[PDB]
């Protein structure tokens, strides 16, 4: 009966999700996370629905 799951405010979770979505678009943050997107044309990268 040690605590395993931790409650987080819904709005705080969504705040963090929005920050992560926004950081997706930042070129420097993706490089810092190390995602080898240098030869990508531009980010946030978008493709057609054929994908």
Residues that bind other proteins (CB under 8 A): 1, 3-7
CB nearer to other proteins: give 1 or 34: 1
Nearest distance, CB of residue 47 and other proteins, angstroms? 35
Rounded CA separation 33/26 (Å): 11
CB nearer to other proteins: give 6 or 51: 6
- In the block, residue with structure tokens 């009966």: 1
User: In this structure, what token pair is assigned to residue 19?
Assistant: 């920050």
Cβ neighbours around 2 below 10 Å, total: 3
Nearest distance, CB of residue 6 and other proteins, angstroms? 8
């Amino acid at each position: 009966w040690r605590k395993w799951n931790v409650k987080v405010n819904h709005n705080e979770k969504r705040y963090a999700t929005a920050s992560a979505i926004a950081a997706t678009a930042v070129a420097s943050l993706v490089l810092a996370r190390g995602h080898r997107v240098e030869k990508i044309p531009e980010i946030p990268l978008v493709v057609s629905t054929d994908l």
